[PDB]
Amino acid sequence: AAQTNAPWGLARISSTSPGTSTYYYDESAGQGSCVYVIDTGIEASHPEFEGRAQMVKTYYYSSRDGNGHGTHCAGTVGSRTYGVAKKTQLFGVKVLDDNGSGQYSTIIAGMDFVASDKNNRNCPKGVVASLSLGGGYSSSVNSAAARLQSSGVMVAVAAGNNNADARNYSPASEPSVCTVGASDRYDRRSSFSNYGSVLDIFGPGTDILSTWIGGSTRSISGTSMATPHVAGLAAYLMTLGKTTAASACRYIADTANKGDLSNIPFGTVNLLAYNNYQA
CA distance 213 to 3: 24
- List the beta bridge partners of residue 262: 188
**118 phi/psi in degrees, rounded to 5:** -60, -25
CA distance 6 to 2: 9
Domains annotated on the chain, with CATH: 2-272 (3.40.50.200)
Tell me the C-alpha distance between 222 and 191, whole Å: 9
Residues at the binding site for Ca(2+) are 16, 175, 177, 200, 260
72 is catalytic: no
3-state secondary structure the chain: CEECCCCHHHHHHCCCCCCCCCEECCCCCCCCEEEEEEECCCCCCCHHHCCCEEEEEECCCCCCCCCCHHHHHHHHHHCCCCCCCCCCEEEEEECCCCCCCCCHHHHHHHHHHHHHHHHHCCCCCEEEEEECCCEECCHHHHHHHHHHHHCCCEEEEECCCCCCEHHHEECCCCCCCEEEEEECCCCEECCCCCECCCCCEEEECCCEEEEECCCEEEEECCHHHHHHHHHHHHHHHHHCCCCCCCCHHHHHHHCCEECCCECCCCCCCCEECCCCCCC
Q: How far is CA 40 from the centre of its chain?
A: 14
**Does the annotation count 219 as an active-site position?**
no
Q: Residue 266 phi/psi, 5° resolution?
A: -55, 130
Tell me how far CA of residue 80 lies from CA of 38, 63, 202, in angstroms: 20, 22, 23
How many angstroms separate the CA atoms of 246 and 251, rounded?
10
> With 0-12 CB in 10 A as exposed, 13-18 as middle and 19+ as buried, what is 120?
exposed
Q: Which of 14, 15, 33, 39 is catalytic?
A: 39
- Catalytic member of 183, 190, 193, 224: 224
CA angle centred on 97, ends 233 and 138, rounded to 5°: 70
Euclidean distance between CA atoms 253 and 256, whole angstroms: 5
Torsion of CA 103, 104, 108, 109, to 10 degrees: -30
Structure determined via = X-ray
183 bridge partner residues: 189, 204
Residue type, 278: Q
User: Which value in Å is the resolution of this experimental model?
Assistant: 1.0
* Active-site choice (46, 69, 72, 229): 69
Query: Is 254 annotated in the active site?
Result: no
